[PDB]
Amino acid sequence: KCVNFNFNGLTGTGVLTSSTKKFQPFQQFGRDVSDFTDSVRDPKTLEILDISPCSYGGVSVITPGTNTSKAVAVLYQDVNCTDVPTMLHVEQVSTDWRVYALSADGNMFQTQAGCLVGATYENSTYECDIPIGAGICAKFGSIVAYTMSIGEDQSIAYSNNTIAIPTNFSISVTTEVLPVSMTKTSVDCNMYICGDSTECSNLLLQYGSFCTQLNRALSGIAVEQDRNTRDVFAQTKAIYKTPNIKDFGGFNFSQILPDPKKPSYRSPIEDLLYNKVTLDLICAQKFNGLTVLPPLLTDDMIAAYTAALISGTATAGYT
Amino acid sequence: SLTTTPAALGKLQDVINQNAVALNTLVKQLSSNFGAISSVLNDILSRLDPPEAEVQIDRLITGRLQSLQTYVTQQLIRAAEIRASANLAATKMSECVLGQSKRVDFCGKGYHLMSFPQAAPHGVVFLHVTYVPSQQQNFTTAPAICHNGKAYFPREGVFVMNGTHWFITQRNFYSPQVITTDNTFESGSCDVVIGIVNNTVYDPLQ
Amino acid sequence: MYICGDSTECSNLLLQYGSFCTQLNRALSGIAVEQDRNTRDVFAQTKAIYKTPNIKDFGGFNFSQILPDPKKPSYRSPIEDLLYNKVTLDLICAQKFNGLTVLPPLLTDDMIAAYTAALISGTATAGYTFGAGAALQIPFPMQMAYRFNGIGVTQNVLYENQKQIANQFNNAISKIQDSLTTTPAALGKLQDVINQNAVALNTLVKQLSSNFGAISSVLNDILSRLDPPEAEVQIDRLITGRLQSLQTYVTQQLIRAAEIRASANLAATKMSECVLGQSKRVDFCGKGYHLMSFPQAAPHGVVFLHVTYVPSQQQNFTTAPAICHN
Amino acid sequence: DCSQDPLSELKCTTKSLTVEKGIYQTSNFRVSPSTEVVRFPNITNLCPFGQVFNASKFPSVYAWERLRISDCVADYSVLYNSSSSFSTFKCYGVSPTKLNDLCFSSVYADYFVVKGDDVRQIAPAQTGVIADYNYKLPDDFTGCVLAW
Ligand SMILES: *[C@@H]1O[C@H](CO)[C@@H](O[C@@H]2O[C@H](CO)[C@@H](O)[C@H](O)[C@H]2NC(C)=O)[C@H](O)[C@H]1NC(C)=O
Ligand SMILES: *[C@@H]1O[C@H](CO)[C@@H](O[C@@H]2O[C@H](CO)[C@@H](O)[C@H](O)[C@H]2NC(C)=O)[C@H](O)[C@H]1NC(C)=O
Ligand SMILES: *[C@@H]1O[C@H](CO)[C@@H](O[C@@H]2O[C@H](CO)[C@@H](O)[C@H](O)[C@H]2NC(C)=O)[C@H](O)[C@H]1NC(C)=O
Ligand SMILES: *[C@@H]1O[C@H](CO)[C@@H](O[C@@H]2O[C@H](CO)[C@@H](O)[C@H](O)[C@H]2NC(C)=O)[C@H](O)[C@H]1NC(C)=O
Numbered sequence: 001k002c003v004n005f006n007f008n009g010l011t012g013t014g015v016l017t018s019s020t021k022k023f024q025p026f027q028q029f030g031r032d033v034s035d036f037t038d039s040v041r042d043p044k045t046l047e048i049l050d051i052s053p054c055s056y057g058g059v060s061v062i063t064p065g066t067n068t069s070k071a072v073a074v075l076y077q078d079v080n081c082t083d084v085p086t087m088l089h090v091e092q093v094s095t096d097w098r099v100y101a102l103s104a105d106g107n108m109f110q111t112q113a114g115c116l117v118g119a120t121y122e123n124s125t126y127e128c129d130i131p132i133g134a135g136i137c138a139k140f141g142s143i144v145a146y147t148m149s150i151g152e153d154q155s156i157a158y159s160n161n162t163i164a165i166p167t168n169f170s171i172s173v174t175t176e177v178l179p180v181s182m183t184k185t186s187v188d189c190n191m192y193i194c195g196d197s198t199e200c201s202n203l204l205l206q207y208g209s210f211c212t213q214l215n216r217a218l219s220g221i222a223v224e225q226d227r228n229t230r231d232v233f234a235q236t237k238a239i240y241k242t243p244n245i246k247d248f249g250g251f252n253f254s255q256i257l258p259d260p261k262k263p264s265y266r267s268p269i270e271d272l273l274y275n276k277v278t279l280d281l282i283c284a285q286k287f288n289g290l291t292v293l294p295p296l297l298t299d300d301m302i303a304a305y306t307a308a309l310i311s312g313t314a315t316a317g318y319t
Numbered sequence: 320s321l322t323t324t325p326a327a328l329g330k331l332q333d334v335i336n337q338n339a340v341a342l343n344t345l346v347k348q349l350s351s352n353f354g355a356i357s358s359v360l361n362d363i364l365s366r367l368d369p370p371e372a373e374v375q376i377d378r379l380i381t382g383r384l385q386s387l388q389t390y391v392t393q394q395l396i397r398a399a400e401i402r403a404s405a406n407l408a409a410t411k412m413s414e415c416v417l418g419q420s421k422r423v424d425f426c427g428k429g430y431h432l433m434s435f436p437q438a439a440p441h442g443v444v445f446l447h448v449t450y451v452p453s454q455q456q457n458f459t460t461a462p463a464i465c466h467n468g469k470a471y472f473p474r475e476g477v478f479v480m481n482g483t484h485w486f487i488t489q490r491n492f493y494s495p496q497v498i499t500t501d502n503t504f505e506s507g508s509c510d511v512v513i514g515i516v517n518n519t520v521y522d523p524l525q
Numbered sequence: 526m527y528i529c530g531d532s533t534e535c536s537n538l539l540l541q542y543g544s545f546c547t548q549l550n551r552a553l554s555g556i557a558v559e560q561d562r563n564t565r566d567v568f569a570q571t572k573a574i575y576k577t578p579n580i581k582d583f584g585g586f587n588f589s590q591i592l593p594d595p596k597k598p599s600y601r602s603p604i605e606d607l608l609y610n611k612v613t614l615d616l617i618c619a620q621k622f623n624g625l626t627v628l629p630p631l632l633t634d635d636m637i638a639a640y641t642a643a644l645i646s647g648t649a650t651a652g653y654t655f656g657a658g659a660a661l662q663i664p665f666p667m668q669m670a671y672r673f674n675g676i677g678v679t680q681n682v683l684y685e686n687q688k689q690i691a692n693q694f695n696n697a698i699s700k701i702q703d704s705l706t707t708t709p710a711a712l713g714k715l716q717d718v719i720n721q722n723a724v725a726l727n728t729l730v731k732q733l734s735s736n737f738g739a740i741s742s743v744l745n746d747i748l749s750r751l752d753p754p755e756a757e758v759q760i761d762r763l764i765t766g767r768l769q770s771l772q773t774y775v776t777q778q779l780i781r782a783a784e785i786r787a788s789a790n791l792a793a794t795k796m797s798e799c800v801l802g803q804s805k806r807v808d809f810c811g812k813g814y815h816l817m818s819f820p821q822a823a824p825h826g827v828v829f830l831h832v833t834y835v836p837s838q839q840q841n842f843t844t845a846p847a848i849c850h851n
Numbered sequence: 852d853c854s855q856d857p858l859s860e861l862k863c864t865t866k867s868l869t870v871e872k873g874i875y876q877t878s879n880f881r882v883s884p885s886t887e888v889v890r891f892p893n894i895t896n897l898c899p900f901g902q903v904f905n906a907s908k909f910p911s912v913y914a915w916e917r918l919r920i921s922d923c924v925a926d927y928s929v930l931y932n933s934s935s936s937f938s939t940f941k942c943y944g945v946s947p948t949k950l951n952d953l954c955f956s957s958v959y960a961d962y963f964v965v966k967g968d969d970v971r972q973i974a975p976a977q978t979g980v981i982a983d984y985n986y987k988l989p990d991d992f993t994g995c996v997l998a999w
């Protein structure tokens with residue numbers, strides 16, 4: 001049972017069991033490499049006991065989201081489903097927990113990761129949603145566990161006297177997204193640590209350049225972020241005027257080039273991108289010495305670069 | 320696709336959210352006592368004289384300094400990850416947009432033709448235009464054709480039979496040509512080529 | 526569990542350090558997720574899974590050592606089994622008792638093997654495998670002819686010497702198992718990853734035996750002997766040192782994670798350019814002129830077999846920049 | 852209530868009454884002890900404090916005596932009735948409030964007579980006639996000093 005204990009003044013909390021270890025004639029307790037006591041000699045009965053942490057190995061709770069249901073499943077890591085009622089402490093403390101710790105028909109499923117309780121098993125394959133273990137995932141549609149699929153099955157028969165050749169084709173366009181830069185921050189290392197305390201300030205000066213080093217590291221990052229942007233967009237120095245013609249032999253560029261007759265300096269697609277990733281604490285940050293610095297290049301300048309790159313491609317080679 | 324798929328730009332949203340959290344987390348670490356009687360320096364100074372106040376203050380200074388140090392360290396690690404991404408984006412600008420790539424799955428999923436960049440907050444979006452084959456048919460093939468005891472091989476493409484006659488076509492698009500002495504080259508002694516078949520190679524001078 | 530263990534007095538004091546404890550958990554969680562992405566981004570190149578053929582002879586070319594044998598208990602190829610048995614290489618109880626555990630990967634070894642088998646099977650039987658929206662069936666000897674043209678060698682060379690080329694291929698593959706069997710260092714890179722992680726965890730556990738300036742490394746002994754006015758001083762020393770030790774562990778895992786992600790990205794690139802296509806880049810997919818590559822599964826990584834064309838027996842001839850006819 | 856069900860243990864762990872879709876590792880708010888197991892050696896005799904504290908004669912400081920204490924119960928509450936009040940009772944090794952909860956592997960009692968002004972010298976890191984020439988304690992002293 002999980003319990004508090006005291007042996008000759010040696011206290012702690014844990015589970016006391018029978019040991020198979022041996023002690024020296026005058027040894028009262030044993031400890032492992034972490035100086036954790038795992039064995040004690042009982043002062044009245046000359047018998048060595050074993051001491052275990054009340055809970056150990058890790059437990060995970062699986063949820064579909066509290067805005068969907070209040071159903072959960074519990075994964076007991078690296079245990080069998082026959083030992084759950086023992087690793088738990090069902091008869092000692094658990095109340096509503098008893099329904100998860102105790103087995104029942106269709107209540108427990110044994111996996112490699114551990115024992116999963118509260119979820120059923122589909123006996124089918126699907127794309128992974130919530131990963132649980134190795135090869136096992138689950139979905140809401142209670143909770144359903146299943147083996148994840150790695151793709152559909154295909155079979156190409158081998159032959160040595162035939163060949164397949166396409167008689168038709170299509171043009172497709174795909175989208176790839178890459179991060180280029182971070183938000184540039186700056187910290188006032190005195191305002192953050194001491195604030196208005198002048199006594200603290202005098203004591204903070206006793207830590208040498210530690211404070212200065214922090215400022216230097218952040219400054220270096222801030223500079224790099226402007227280099228990151230420049231090294232991606234500023235590929236050609238020449239800036240090409242966006243043409244009034246968006247029809248280049250039947251090819252329509254009006255969605256990737258900016259429209260000079262509109263209030264906007266960005267293309268239709270770009271405007272859509274901007275409105276999708278846009279997504280007082282600010283006062284608290286400022287008062288405690290935390291601020292944010294603007295980028296060297298404005299959004300209109302970045303747009304100018306992309307417009308030039310496209311305009312100079314639709315009209316010329318060796319760009 | 321973008322309008323109906325909010326997750327399409329999730330990579331850029333993650334950058335924004337990670338930075339916002341780091342700053343808010345840092346501010347909230349000023350409410351910690353770190354073992355001191357108070358999180359507030361003025362309350363310590365108000366109640367205690369230096370012989371005791373310094374102990375309480377040192378606890379706050381050490382913990383606040385460690386919290387700032389952990390913030391800066393994680394920004395340096397993140398900065399390295401972003402720089403690596405920026406370098407990749409720059410490479411793609413040069414090889415996908417300002418030229419045509421021969422690298423598989425570098426500028427799209429099919430055969431690369433051209434790309435166009437688009438601006439975005441904290442990053443760049445590339446539109447990759449690719450050629451994709453479809454509607455494949457199977458033909459009987461052969462490694463070579465034997466004309467007059469001499470083996471003939473295609474300069475490019477493959478030999479295929481349409482069910483009645485043999486032609487030379489390209490692999491990426493079916494467009495059968497007549498087999499002539501101009502579309503093939505003569506090399507080998509016929510009996511040394513496995514799977515060789517007999518046919519007529521047309522001589523344009525006749 | 527790591528910092529305080531069963532000490533409830535410590536727990537109350539650990540709550541005075543704000544989210545510091547939570548931040549450590551968050552950093553490790555982020556790494557754990559990335560590691561599953563690293564694997565997926567390398568092996569899951571094609572969604573379609575191709576059935577492994579019963580025929581391992583593709584025009585004289587023997588694939589039986591790189592494809593799994595469906596008639597055997599094993600789902601891995603001969604070479605893969607060898608790789609697995611070379612990098613395989615209670616402290617565990619001590620780790621668990623002190624709050625340190627290890628989580629399994631999302632993909633099992635059989636699933637990784639399934640991916641590599643599909644990649645090879647779909648290459649031996651078809652082209653345009655990088656797109657695979659319209660996989661194109663082709664005879665293997667003809668695929669080789671194409672690959673030869675790609676290195677500036679007229680395809681008639683392959684057909685006339687098909688028997689010798691197939692024999693050289695088959696012998697070169699057989700030598701792979703002998704090379705690996707007799708060279709334990711061949712997979713040293715994967716062994717290093719395993720050992721570095723094992724050491725970091727054992728080192729962390731052993732830092733709980735440190736006093737850090739306190740009268741004792743054990744919280745229960747401090748609490749047993751001292752009242753709060755003095756006990757708190759001794760406890761604070763232990764909490765600070767244990768927290769610093771956890772912080773140094775997490776920081777070094779983040780640095781190492783960055784290095785592995787970079788390697789995973791390179792492996793994914795090679796899968797696309799060396800295996801699912803033919804490379805024109807010098808010393809990227811082998812040492813000679815690249816023809817084709819095949820992936821093999823391994824613990825914590827991937828092994829590539831690169832097939833290259835190597836020239837030999839050179840002779841010197843008199844040359845000229847041009848000829849004048851009339 | 853963090854101890855009621857697996858969802859409360861998750862809500863408490865994440866410090867949020869709203870939890871997003873996914874799998875989370877949780878803290879142990881589930882199992883807690885309700886009793887205590889206390890085990891001490893078979894000792895029925897009280898320590899002979901009267902032998903030293905109520906002695907008919909003490910030694911001089913230059914020639915102090917040592918007595919070993921063993922196989923007894925260190926009950927210090929008996930000194931409330933059977934002993935003169937202590938003007939000094941300073942423990943360096945342990946807190947004086949913990950003495951009744953501890954077991955010791957060895958106990959020694961050193962006793963002598965000094966004048967009032969010299970009582971302050973019976974401690975670690977002291978100077979003076981007694982500290983230097985008569986009776987000295989180590990810097991790493993574990994024990995208690997009593998005087999009346
Ligand atoms: C300490 O005292 C207890 C009594 O409370 C002893 O208990 C005895 O245990 C033995 C078994 O070894 C029994 O046969 C006796 O009948 C028990 N005695 C009584 C009065 O019940 C215990 O053995 C003693 N331990 C030591 C080391 O002396
Ligand atoms: C390739 O296939 C596409 C169909 O996917 C063909 O496009 C169609 O062509 C007909 C004219 O015969 C039009 O009436 C249809 O509206 C077109 N469909 C689409 C979606 O545009 C295309 O012409 C074929 N190309 C070749 C060379 O055969
Ligand atoms: C290029 O594409 C745009 C749409 O993106 C075309 O503009 C549309 O034209 C139709 C027909 O006149 C109108 O009904 C739509 O309202 C227009 N949409 C917008 C946003 O203006 C444009 O005509 C195309 N250009 C060419 C040369 O084909
Ligand atoms: C296979 O190729 C032959 C030769 O080109 C095709 O036969 C010709 O078909 C056209 C009609 O499209 C006739 O006008 C010619 O006179 C035919 N020539 C001969 C020699 O027959 C044949 O139709 C092709 N079959 C297929 C399925 O492509």
Ligand SMILES: *[C@@H]1O[C@H](CO)[C@@H](O[C@@H]2O[C@H](CO)[C@@H](O)[C@H](O)[C@H]2NC(C)=O)[C@H](O)[C@H]1NC(C)=O
Nearest residue numbers: 159160161162460461462513514515584664666
């Ligand atoms: C394609 O493979 C077939 C067998 O599937 C080959 O035909 C066999 O060739 C061998 C060797 O000459 C003969 O012993 C068999 O009797 C043939 N079988 C049949 C059904 O014909 C065929 O020659 C191969 N073709 C190419 C181009 O490699």
Ligand SMILES: *[C@@H]1O[C@H](CO)[C@@H](O[C@@H]2O[C@H](CO)[C@@H](O)[C@H](O)[C@H]2NC(C)=O)[C@H](O)[C@H]1NC(C)=O
Nearest residue numbers: 580581582583585586587588589590603695699
């Ligand atoms: C492909 O290579 C394997 C060896 O890796 C060949 O299998 C061997 O064949 C010889 C001759 O019958 C036997 O003595 C060996 O014991 C076999 N080894 C194993 C492991 O089975 C196989 O025959 C080759 N296949 C082809 C078509 O050449």
Ligand SMILES: *[C@@H]1O[C@H](CO)[C@@H](O)[C@H](O)[C@H]1NC(C)=O
Nearest residue numbers: 065066067068069869871872
């Ligand atoms: C959660 O459910 C409430 C209804 O109780 C709804 O108004 C809200 O928009 C939902 N939020 C999310 C993220 O689904």
Ligand SMILES: *[C@@H]1O[C@H](CO)[C@@H](O)[C@H](O)[C@H]1NC(C)=O
Nearest residue numbers: 077078079080081082083114
């Ligand atoms: C679970 O039971 C199996 C026997 O079926 C045993 O081999 C394995 O070690 C057990 N695992 C645990 C964590 O007890």
Ligand SMILES: *[C@@H]1O[C@H](CO)[C@@H](O)[C@H](O)[C@H]1NC(C)=O
Nearest residue numbers: 109110111121122123124147
């Ligand atoms: C799935 O169902 C089959 C019976 O069709 C059974 O043999 C198999 O063990 C089940 N899978 C699991 C994980 O129990």
Ligand SMILES: *[C@@H]1O[C@H](CO)[C@@H](O)[C@H](O)[C@H]1NC(C)=O
Nearest residue numbers: 159161162456457458459460
């Ligand atoms: C082409 O494939 C079909 C099956 O879809 C098969 O019936 C036909 O015989 C094949 N053509 C040749 C020349 O083998």
Ligand SMILES: *[C@@H]1O[C@H](CO)[C@@H](O)[C@H](O)[C@H]1NC(C)=O
Nearest residue numbers: 465467468514515516517518
């Ligand atoms: C045609 O080729 C076959 C081999 O496929 C050969 O046996 C036959 O003799 C050849 N016919 C002539 C006229 O050369």
Ligand SMILES: *[C@@H]1O[C@H](CO)[C@@H](O)[C@H](O)[C@H]1NC(C)=O
Nearest residue numbers: 838839840841842843844845
């Ligand atoms: C080729 O090299 C040899 C030396 O190995 C030399 O003697 C010979 O003259 C060279 N051939 C020519 C054409 O120079």
Ligand SMILES: *[C@@H]1O[C@H](CO)[C@@H](O)[C@H](O)[C@H]1NC(C)=O
Nearest residue numbers: 901904905906907933934935
């Ligand atoms: C203890 O000492 C007092 C004198 O202070 C004396 O009167 C008393 O008798 C002594 N107790 C015993 C048991 O001798």
Ligand SMILES: *[C@@H]1O[C@H](CO)[C@@H](O)[C@H](O)[C@H]1NC(C)=O
Nearest residue numbers: 928929930931932933934935
């Ligand atoms: C209190 O002290 C007297 C001696 O003056 C003694 O006889 C008596 O027993 C003591 N009381 C208790 C409870 O021991």
